[PDB]
Design an enzyme around this catalytic site. Structure first.
Site, PDB file in Angstrom:
ATOM      1  N   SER B 592       0.752  -1.400   0.145  1.00  0.00           N
ATOM      2  CA  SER B 592      -0.094  -0.088   0.083  1.00  0.00           C
ATOM      3  C   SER B 592       0.618   1.155  -0.061  1.00  0.00           C
ATOM      4  O   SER B 592       1.542   1.569  -0.972  1.00  0.00           O
ATOM      5  CB  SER B 592      -0.938  -0.217   1.280  1.00  0.00           C
ATOM      6  OG  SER B 592      -1.585   1.306   1.844  1.00  0.00           O
ATOM      7  N   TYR B 593       0.792   2.122   1.120  1.00  0.00           N
ATOM      8  CA  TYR B 593       1.591   3.424   1.317  1.00  0.00           C
ATOM      9  C   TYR B 593       3.105   2.885   0.907  1.00  0.00           C
ATOM     10  O   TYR B 593       3.781   3.413   0.435  1.00  0.00           O
ATOM     11  CB  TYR B 593       1.461   3.845   2.457  1.00  0.00           C
ATOM     12  CG  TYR B 593       1.842   5.580   2.392  1.00  0.00           C
ATOM     13  CD1 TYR B 593       3.212   5.676   2.336  1.00  0.00           C
ATOM     14  CD2 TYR B 593       0.792   6.369   2.301  1.00  0.00           C
ATOM     15  CE1 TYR B 593       3.415   7.235   1.831  1.00  0.00           C
ATOM     16  CE2 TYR B 593       1.229   7.704   1.955  1.00  0.00           C
ATOM     17  CZ  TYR B 593       2.548   7.890   1.973  1.00  0.00           C
ATOM     18  OH  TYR B 593       2.862   9.411   1.437  1.00  0.00           O
ATOM     19  N   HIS B 702      -7.551  -6.027  -1.616  1.00  0.00           N
ATOM     20  CA  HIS B 702      -6.555  -5.449  -1.095  1.00  0.00           C
ATOM     21  C   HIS B 702      -5.491  -6.082  -0.166  1.00  0.00           C
ATOM     22  O   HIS B 702      -4.437  -5.853  -0.170  1.00  0.00           O
ATOM     23  CB  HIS B 702      -6.764  -4.089  -0.277  1.00  0.00           C
ATOM     24  CG  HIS B 702      -5.806  -3.129   0.047  1.00  0.00           C
ATOM     25  ND1 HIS B 702      -4.812  -2.566  -1.308  1.00  0.00           N
ATOM     26  CD2 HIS B 702      -5.140  -2.536   1.098  1.00  0.00           C
ATOM     27  CE1 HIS B 702      -3.958  -1.913  -0.510  1.00  0.00           C
ATOM     28  NE2 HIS B 702      -4.232  -1.720   0.471  1.00  0.00           N
TER      29      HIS B 702
HETATM   30  C1  LIG Z   1      -2.553   1.453   2.203  1.00  0.00           C
HETATM   31  O1  LIG Z   1      -2.153   1.815   3.490  1.00  0.00           O
HETATM   32  N1  LIG Z   1      -3.351   0.019   2.600  1.00  0.00           N
HETATM   33  C2  LIG Z   1      -2.728  -0.699   3.575  1.00  0.00           C
HETATM   34  C3  LIG Z   1      -2.879  -0.105   5.005  1.00  0.00           C
HETATM   35  C4  LIG Z   1      -4.147  -0.501   5.578  1.00  0.00           C
HETATM   36  C5  LIG Z   1      -1.548  -0.573   5.999  1.00  0.00           C
HETATM   37  C6  LIG Z   1      -1.954   0.079   7.466  1.00  0.00           C
HETATM   38  C7  LIG Z   1      -3.204  -2.180   3.706  1.00  0.00           C
HETATM   39  O2  LIG Z   1      -2.669  -3.284   3.758  1.00  0.00           O
HETATM   40  O3  LIG Z   1      -4.736  -2.111   3.669  1.00  0.00           O
HETATM   41  C8  LIG Z   1      -3.719   2.434   1.705  1.00  0.00           C
HETATM   42  C9  LIG Z   1      -3.034   3.252   0.407  1.00  0.00           C
HETATM   43  C10 LIG Z   1      -2.893   4.613   1.494  1.00  0.00           C
HETATM   44  C11 LIG Z   1      -3.930   4.652   2.326  1.00  0.00           C
HETATM   45  N2  LIG Z   1      -4.333   3.325   2.478  1.00  0.00           N
HETATM   46  C12 LIG Z   1      -5.263   2.772   3.030  1.00  0.00           C
HETATM   47  O4  LIG Z   1      -5.754   1.664   2.781  1.00  0.00           O
HETATM   48  C13 LIG Z   1      -6.007   3.910   4.017  1.00  0.00           C
HETATM   49  N3  LIG Z   1      -7.431   3.810   3.812  1.00  0.00           N
HETATM   50  C14 LIG Z   1      -5.695   3.386   5.544  1.00  0.00           C
HETATM   51  C15 LIG Z   1      -6.539   4.600   6.434  1.00  0.00           C
HETATM   52  C16 LIG Z   1      -6.229   2.067   6.070  1.00  0.00           C
HETATM   53  C17 LIG Z   1      -4.342   3.643   5.782  1.00  0.00           C
END
Ligand SMILES: *[C@](=O)([N][C]([C]([C])[C][C])C([O])=O)[C]1[C][C][C]N1C(=O)[C]([N])C([C])([C])[C]
Ligand SMILES: *[C@@H]1O[C@H](CO)[C@@H](O[C@@H]2O[C@H](CO)[C@@H](O[C@@H]3O[C@H](CO)[C@@H](O)[C@H](O)[C@@H]3O)[C@H](O)[C@H]2NC(C)=O)[C@H](O)[C@H]1NC(C)=O
Ligand SMILES: *[C@@H]1O[C@H](CO)[C@@H](O[C@@H]2O[C@H](CO)[C@@H](O)[C@H](O)[C@H]2NC(C)=O)[C@H](O)[C@H]1NC(C)=O
Ligand SMILES: *[C@@H]1O[C@H](CO)[C@@H](O[C@@H]2O[C@H](CO)[C@@H](O)[C@H](O)[C@H]2NC(C)=O)[C@H](O)[C@H]1NC(C)=O
Ligand SMILES: *[C@@H]1O[C@H](CO)[C@@H](O[C@@H]2O[C@H](CO)[C@@H](O)[C@H](O)[C@H]2NC(C)=O)[C@H](O)[C@H]1NC(C)=O
Ligand SMILES: *[C@](=O)([N][C]([C]([C])[C][C])C([O])=O)[C]1[C][C][C]N1C(=O)[C]([N])C([C])([C])[C]
Ligand SMILES: *[C@@H]1O[C@H](CO)[C@@H](O)[C@H](O)[C@H]1NC(C)=O
Ligand SMILES: *[C@@H]1O[C@H](CO)[C@@H](O)[C@H](O)[C@H]1NC(C)=O
Ligand SMILES: *[C@@H]1O[C@H](CO)[C@@H](O)[C@H](O)[C@H]1NC(C)=O
Ligand SMILES: *[C@@H]1O[C@H](CO)[C@@H](O)[C@H](O)[C@H]1NC(C)=O
Ligand SMILES: *[C@@H]1O[C@H](CO)[C@@H](O)[C@H](O)[C@H]1NC(C)=O
Ligand SMILES: *[C@@H]1O[C@H](CO)[C@@H](O)[C@H](O)[C@H]1NC(C)=O
Ligand SMILES: *[C@@H]1O[C@H](CO)[C@@H](O)[C@H](O)[C@H]1NC(C)=O
Ligand SMILES: *[C@@H]1O[C@H](CO)[C@@H](O)[C@H](O)[C@H]1NC(C)=O
Lengths: 728, 728
Positions: B592-593, B702
């Site tokens: 993700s991030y 995801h």
């Molecule tokens: C990403 O962060 N997804 C991750 C997060 C939840 C790890 C903590 C995952 O594995 O689901 C994505 C892209 C940036 C933002 N993000 C999110 O899913 C957000 N909605 C949060 C608030 C869950 C970080």
């Protein structure tokens, strides 16, 4: 000389293979663009003039990607704004340029986003499709006349084929047929109303915040198919305050009885049209020669004027029943069909008599009829030297089917074994196209004395360049499989050291009636793999392949993924015996059907292959379109062929992929073999705990032909192999 | 000799970490699922007793997924046929079981595909959402009573959040709130009409002939947002032939002027409710405390009862504004906000006054308010030892804010530095929850004597096992970047030899307010990478990370992809100079991030990283949803922040990927970070001419959490790494 043919050479086409495209416009004249301008050539003398000077080209909008001069030579169409759709389909914008006044028609112009357009056989009338409707312009400057109204996007098609007729039945987008003299305009209407929709995502340019969902009416195996209607339109009464005079011709009872396809349209005379229909099952077709009843405008049929063609061992024709070739008078016709021996040969037919007479016999096949005169029939066959992978031009004397001569055969035996031909209007002249084994060669011939006349293009420039590069050599040879002589080819590395053990790349297709082994000269990726990477590339045509009689070609009827797959394995096994091959370094790759076969092979557990690459592969026939799939498999129902549909999926062989290295590639916007196929294959391998590699290509279609995308996949595939062969 | 923690160990969960899940049901009792029986424990003396035996479950006929006992303990709710939707949402079927007649209720049962259900806070009343409409059941055996009639798929949502409110605002699917005594049932309504739909294919099970297309109203950066309404229903009038008496509470004018979000609901008393709204801009939120007017049935607001919270350096709260915690009377409340120095601490608010007094201060932050009595306030913070990555329970004296005790800092210092708690009603008892550095440990305590009553779970079993195996060590420490100390962590291989040089792997997240460096105990993929592959796995919290005040956290405000990306590069650049790190073998990976940061890092051209793996990465912020994205980036307009939205895409750095081994992985059914993201990114690379490896996971969302999928991705990443690191 110490440099080799490289991937960049292949990717950038550093070595240019020239050709010579002309357009006959009379029995002795053709149009040829040279240095951007349309020159008029005289076949007899070679002397030429100007028809359209480059510069008359003033980059209208974008540029001229194609032209078309009207038959009476008074006008000429300019195609620009090209925007592809499917394999053949595309929209464009057109300009009509008056040759007399050498002016550009500016009033009553052709629409934007025109789907199809075409001059009449004589004169300069125009028919064109736009928004699924037909239009006729009797005069360039004059206003057009709308022919159909039902035109509905993704629902009703008038003048152009839908997705499956384009890809599987006509190999064209066009569904308009001008009568010889332009009196009548024939067209087909396709109705997709009840045809399910394939829906995939198209991401478009990075600026598109939300992806777009492409939706195409695409009938998969067993699904509801589109329906067709045929109409003959009398353009004589076309007037703005008049309705349209059209007659609907239906298929003969024997086919109107159920789902069917209209696969052929041939005008014989101004009052005689020949319709070719086939049933959904596609092992029963029929020609219906209809006559125009002057007193009523109807187009009539007769049991005596109908001809049936059926198959008990498989399907009719190669990919469709072969087209009829009528005599001028229209009372008889010559058409290719199978023997009692199962070989594709020419049979002479009588318009109203059911018995025909083969005028060719032999353990070889007629590929096609190219020209017909009041005395001769011109055709192309793979007879010469009995090698099916070659093609040659033959002429047979109609009054004596014993007088048959071969025109191309001895011209250049070493350089030319594969030909195609283009004849002038009344077959007085013809251009011969040599595609190999040597460099291409285009020449002009006079039918009268079959005299050489002149060499249009010898690729002399290309020959120069290649004498400095270390090119691989290509050899074709046979091998015996369960009694039968099958053909294969091997692209071998330069300075071939027989003491060394070279790795092996099997390039496969293996689809029904397919032919991977031929004498066609090519500058491919394999060339690079052999010239630079010292990898041997071979292909094999076994049971299922075409151009060798129905017995071979039909072997896999109703059982895809079996014999053609197995013959590749045994063929490779044989090859792995030759001393110059490293049987511990053998890979196999393929595209489409080749990707399917390649997959089936890897998952065969033969332990024969170390790694393979499947590009845009079929993985489960129920996912492919009905016209093609059923033609070989029938219906996926337990009352018919469900069993062989289920045991031929790749997924069913997942467990075996644990034994090899597999690269699965697929364009995300493949309207042909939907991305789904691979998505389902990968999910299966994942469930099987099988590891493997993948490469998706965003927004690329079945061709993965965009410049950057073309370069990428071949570059990627190249590393995977080198990686598989432990190469530098 | 000894064994190492293997990949199969991590994937199969061979070493199972145990825990203790209880559910307080009174000031001194709690339910606990043991042996599939439900035991009722008495915290006073620890004596238990059976509440429901596994016999009951054998008799149901379906796999019980979960249950919920009514507050009055008369009924229990059995949940089956669980079908996951998003991260929190899901639908299910429900059985209500009578605990006296110990008979299953079968009359007037609850619908299947029920989206949400909850008992009232007292008694056995029920409230549930079906088809986006709300329903109320006073008695389990009597018919329910429909409350809303506007429920519409993908359009109107009553009682449950839409996709964006689910993922970003409530971190819950639930959108309804019962008042303390069950008099009022307040809920929120969401209108998604004008919200654009994200569409993508879902191939489903191999047998589906046509892929289905999933459509989710999902707003992207700048797009149109869902709107919301809040209502408080006076359930006292509910009755078959009576209308629903409800009241609508709207946000104060300062927020109503433009786009807003309902972000918090807190019942204070039967007659006082607290709503928390925030502008779409998110640097301005407000708390509105409404009181029930007995004479007219409405809920009134007042400027006196409004409390504003704003951020001038970035956003409010961490992923939303902190929640207020009211005293039993509701005349004051306690809430976390940033103090003058930029550190989040507790402020005591006067319900009808605007100024608040800080009851905590320092260069650390309160993580959250846990319990509240008339005399004490219990909370969590990373104060102890000044290490942000730690968590501890503290009790502050309400009458003397100087008197604060740390109830868990000394209990087991070396084994426990990360705590979470759970108090009973009135906070008489509390279970402590230690998550590291040592094996998690669950204990119970008394609030009156703070004695450690007993140990609920100490994981001695796990400890036993890990003894025979060579686990890795997790060292935590600190470094300096631009005059600031940030924490990092390293998972070192067994027998870590400060002498030898090891390959380093940076595991990163680095998203706003994130903490990838903590003292939590984890049996992770990294545990195998160090234990079996002797690879060092490091994590670093630089700018933008949380729990260290706003100066650190807001550093990346309106400029994502900058400092946080840059800080990982400097951090690593240092780790490499440490002598036990082999600078020739450094990699980075994230999800993700992390996938985004990872990607930007590789695209930086720092020469530091050799290879990297990105999973489900964001690649262009305009592709992510509005609530999260805008919060840190603003609107993607030039009047605002479009400039930084543009130079922060991963595609913008594509050219630099030519120098690294990249591995892009995404799940085709990712509804959070859309597949589109990796599709656009792969497209950029192909165009730049970058070679890279890819891997899609069919129908995986995801988390790519299905079983085989989970095993497959780690297996796939392990070979990639090892291949990158030259590891057999
Ligand atoms: C990403 O962060 N997804 C991750 C997060 C939840 C790890 C903590 C995952 O594995 O689901 C994505 C892209 C940036 C933002 N993000 C999110 O899913 C957000 N909605 C949060 C608030 C869950 C970080
Ligand atoms: C229904 O409830 C009964 C209890 O009344 C459950 O029986 C208990 O089951 C557990 C789990 O197997 C047993 O624990 C075992 O203890 C040994 C001690 O050495 C340990 O080695 C094992 O790992 C395990 O933890 C317990 O002894 C047993 N007690 C009884 C009553 O015999 C039963 O499992 C439940 N049945 C269902 C439907 O699950
Ligand atoms: C295309 O085919 C469909 C049938 O698949 C035709 O639809 C029918 O039309 C008739 C008369 O218009 C209706 O009475 C039927 O109820 C329709 N059936 C269905 C399934 O829609 C349609 O009219 C055809 N279109 C054209 C122009 O030929
Ligand atoms: C599908 O199943 C059929 C039969 O169940 C397979 O055909 C058999 O193939 C073996 C070779 O392995 C032959 O020895 C048998 O004689 C064949 N039986 C028949 C009835 O022909 C067929 O190969 C399978 N197809 C696929 C795709 O695996
Ligand atoms: C987007 O552009 C901005 C402005 O050009 C970048 O910020 C500057 O980056 C340089 C070089 O790293 C620094 O020396 C400056 O101090 C920065 N100034 C400003 C105005 O912030 C920013 O790093 C870029 N962001 C991305 C994603 O690359
Ligand atoms: C695939 O084979 N298509 C290939 C063919 C055309 C290579 C000669 C390609 O690259 O387009 C698929 C799967 C088998 C059938 N097929 C088709 O596309 C067919 N419609 C044909 C008739 C074009 C092969
Ligand atoms: C070729 O020359 C002849 C004159 O002998 C002329 O009649 C003919 O039109 C010429 N053809 C062209 C198009 O050059
Ligand atoms: C047009 O043709 C002339 C030859 O007559 C040629 O010299 C010129 O380059 C051409 N112009 C182009 C390139 O369009
Ligand atoms: C055709 O109809 C149009 C209607 O506007 C009329 O103007 C025109 O005269 C008609 N054509 C003739 C002359 O029949
Ligand atoms: C044509 O093929 C179909 C396959 O479903 C079959 O039922 C029919 O008998 C075949 N007819 C002939 C002549 O082979
Ligand atoms: C625990 O023992 C006490 C006896 O003092 C009793 O009142 C209580 O109900 C018991 N609870 C349980 C769980 O058995
Ligand atoms: C939802 O919003 C649309 C416009 O965005 C409006 O027309 C419609 O009436 C609203 N419906 C409800 C139930 O509020
Ligand atoms: C509710 O109304 C229905 C008819 O509308 C009637 O049958 C029933 O008796 C009424 N019950 C009450 C609560 O008055
Ligand atoms: C809140 O955000 C808006 C737009 O992002 C900005 O103009 C305004 O100044 C901000 N308020 C504060 C307290 O900085």
């Amino acid at each position: 000389s110490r440099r080799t043919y490289t991937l960049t050479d292949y990717l950038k086409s550093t070595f240019r293979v020239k050709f010579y495209t002309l357009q006959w416009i009379s029995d002795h004249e053709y149009l040829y663009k040279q240095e951007n301008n349309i020159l008029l050539f005289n076949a007899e003398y070679g002397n030429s003039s100007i028809f359209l000077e480059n510069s008359t080209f003033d980059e209208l909008g974008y540029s001229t990607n194609d032209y078309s001069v009207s038959p009476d030579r008074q006008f000429i169409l300019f195609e620009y704004n090209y925007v592809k759709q499917w394999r053949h389909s595309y929209t464009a914008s057109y300009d009509i340029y008056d040759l007399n006044k050498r002016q550009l028609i500016t009033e009553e112009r052709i629409p934007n986003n025109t789907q199809w357009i075409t001059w009449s056989p004589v004169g300069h009338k125009l028919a064109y499709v736009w928004n699924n409707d037909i239009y006729v312009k009797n005069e360039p400057n004059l206003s057009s006349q709308r022919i159909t109204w039902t035109g509905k996007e993704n629902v009703i098609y008038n003048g152009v084929t839908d997705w499956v007729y384009e890809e599987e039945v006509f190999s064209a987008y066009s569904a308009l047929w001008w009568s010889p003299n332009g009196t009548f305009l024939a067209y087909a209407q396709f109705n997709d109303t009840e045809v399910p929709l394939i829906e995939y995502s198209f991401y478009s340019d990075e600026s598109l915040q939300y992806p777009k969902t492409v939706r195409i009416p695409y009938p998969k195996a067993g699904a509801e198919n589109p329906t067709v209607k045929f109409f003959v339109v009398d353009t004589r009464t076309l007037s703005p305050n008049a309705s349209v005079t059209s007659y609907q011709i239906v298929p003969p009872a024997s086919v109107l009885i159920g789902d069917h396809y209209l696969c052929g349209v041939t005008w014989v005379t101004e009052e005689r049209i020949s319709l070719q229909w086939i049933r959904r099952a596609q092992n029963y077709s029929i020609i219906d020669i209809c006559d125009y009843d002057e007193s009523t405008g109807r187009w009539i049929s007769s049991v005596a004027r109908q001809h049936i063609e059926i198959s008990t061992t498989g399907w009719v024709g190669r990919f469709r029943p072969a087209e009829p070739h009528f005599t001028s008078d229209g009372n008889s016709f010559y058409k290719i069909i199978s023997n009692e021996e199962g070989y594709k040969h020419i049979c002479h037919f009588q318009t109203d008599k059911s018995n025909c007479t083969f005028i060719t016999k032999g353990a070889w096949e007629v590929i096609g009829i190219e020209a017909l005169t009041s005395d001769y029939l011109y055709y192309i066959s793979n007879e010469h030297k009995g090698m099916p992978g070659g093609r040659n031009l033959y002429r047979i004397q109609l009054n004596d089917y014993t007088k048959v001569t071969c025109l191309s055969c001895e011209l250049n035996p070493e350089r030319c074994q594969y030909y195609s031909a283009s004849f002038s209007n009344k077959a007085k002249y013809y251009q011969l196209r040599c595609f190999g084994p040597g460099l291409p060669l285009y020449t002009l011939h006079s039918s009268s004395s079959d005299k050489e006349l002149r060499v249009l293009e010898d690729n002399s420039a290309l020959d120069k360049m290649l004498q400095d590069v270390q090119m691989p050599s290509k050899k074709l040879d046979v091998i015996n499989l369960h009694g039968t002589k099958f053909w294969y080819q091997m692209i071998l590395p330069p300075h071939f050291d027989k003491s060394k053990k070279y790795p092996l790349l099997i390039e496969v297709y293996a689809g029904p009636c397919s032919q991977k082994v031929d004498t066609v000269f090519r500058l491919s990726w394999a060339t690079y793999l052999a010239s630079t990477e010292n990898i041997i590339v071979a292909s094999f045509d076994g049971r299922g392949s075409g151009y060798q009689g129905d017995k071979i070609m039909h072997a896999i009827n109703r059982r895809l993924g079996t014999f053609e797959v197995e013959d590749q394995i045994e063929a490779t096994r044989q090859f792995s015996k030759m001393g110059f091959v490293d049987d511990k370094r053998i890979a196999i790759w393929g595209w489409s059907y080749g990707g399917y076969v390649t997959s089936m092979v890897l998952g065969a557990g033969s332990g024969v292959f170390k790694c393979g690459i499947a590009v845009a592969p079929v993985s489960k026939w129920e996912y492919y379109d009905s016209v093609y799939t059923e033609r070989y498999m029938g219906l996926p129902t337990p009352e018919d062929n469900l069993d062989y549909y289920r045991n031929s999926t790749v997924m069913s062989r997942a467990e075996n992929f644990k034994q090899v290295e597999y690269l699965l590639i697929h364009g995300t916007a493949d309207d042909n073999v939907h991305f789904q196929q691979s998505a389902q294959l990968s999910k299966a391998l994942v469930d099987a705990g099988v590891d493997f590699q993948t490469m998706w290509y965003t927004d690329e279609d079945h061709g993965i032909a965009s410049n950057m995308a073309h370069q990428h996949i071949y570059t990627h595939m190249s590393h995977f192999l080198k990686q598989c062969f432990s190469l530098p």
